[PDB]
């Protein structure tokens, strides 16, 4: 009844009125590749790096089962597939989204979506949370807040899944393309601060083929940031 016309992602979709986390269910259940788990609301939403993710009714909370079977060097791009899919869907809805390295999408610098990829064996789960008509935390935004009125949630779902399927098939063909789509859609040129051991400041200018954020320090020196290794803050 959803009328999806995708090849892999969206061949089957399991809906829940509510659940703790769509990502957990996708990880603990045996499911065909491309299966999409979606819920009206999540009570135990998972954010990345141990953060929590608010998932009230009105938003799009989903997880996708994937079995890319690619080399380890290509795994860092999976989060990007989700982020770029969101950007493309926002574009269709006349919303200008940018990627905040490496898993968030911002509109006028307010978070409108977040991506979390989880692995457990052969299985890979792509989780995506997109603020549509739901209430959002302070400093964040949603499609309804951007557009000024309610947005048809199923249409957003259909749009996002359709973009993800195409991106995924393209990824399977040439896993290098997603990197350029990310480079052309991410926030770059902004000054950032890297905290912890070996603290330093610089301009976030691009990402390498592993997705590492390239920082240009005032001295012209170049350093690469690995996600989860250090804390980053905008200046």
């Amino acid at each position: 009844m959803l009328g999806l016309k995708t090849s892999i992602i969206g061949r089957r979709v399991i809906y829940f009125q509510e659940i703790t986390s769509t990502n957990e269910f996708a990880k603990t259940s045996y499911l065909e590749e491309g299966t999409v788990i979606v819920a009206d609301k999540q009570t135990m939403g998972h954010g990345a790096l141990n953060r929590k993710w608010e998932s009230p009714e009105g938003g799009l909370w989903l997880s996708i089962v994937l079995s890319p079977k690619v080399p380890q060097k290509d795994l860092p791009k999976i989060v990007f597939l989700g982020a770029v899919g969101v950007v493309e869907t926002l574009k269709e809805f006349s919303i200008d989204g940018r990627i905040k390295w490496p898993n968030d999408v911002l509109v006028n610098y307010k978070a409108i979506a977040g991506v979390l990829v989880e692995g457990k064996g052969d299985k890979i789960v792509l989780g995506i949370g997109l603020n549509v008509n739901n209430k959002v935390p302070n400093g964040a935004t949603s499609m309804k807040l951007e557009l000024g009125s309610e947005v048809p949630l199923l249409s957003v779902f259909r749009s996002l899944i359709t973009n993800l399927d195409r991106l995924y098939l393209n990824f399977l063909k040439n896993p290098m393309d997603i990197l350029n789509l990310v480079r052309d859609n991410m926030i770059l040129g902004v000054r950032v601060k890297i905290l912890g051991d070996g603290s330093f400041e610089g301009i976030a200018e691009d990402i390498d083929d592993f997705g590492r954020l390239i920082i240009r320090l005032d001295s012209g020196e170049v350093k690469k940031v690995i996600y989860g290794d250090v804390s980053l803050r905008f200046l």
Binding site: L49, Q72, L116, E118, K120, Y227
Partner: protein, 69 residues
Amino acid sequence: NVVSAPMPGKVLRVLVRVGDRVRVGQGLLVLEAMKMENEIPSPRDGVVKRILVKEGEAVDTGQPLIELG
């Protein structure tokens, strides 16, 4: 026996405490690697004898992570 790291990464969190009984396939800890959060499953049922790594610790392939009784 011993559960080792399937790949290099940074321990995001440890899901079990020493002395806790676990099942086959239950997550023992989580490793942040390649912009993914990789939950490491227990090869078999048993009790957690010792936890060899700490949250925040960088590990390499094959490194011992958990010891079951």
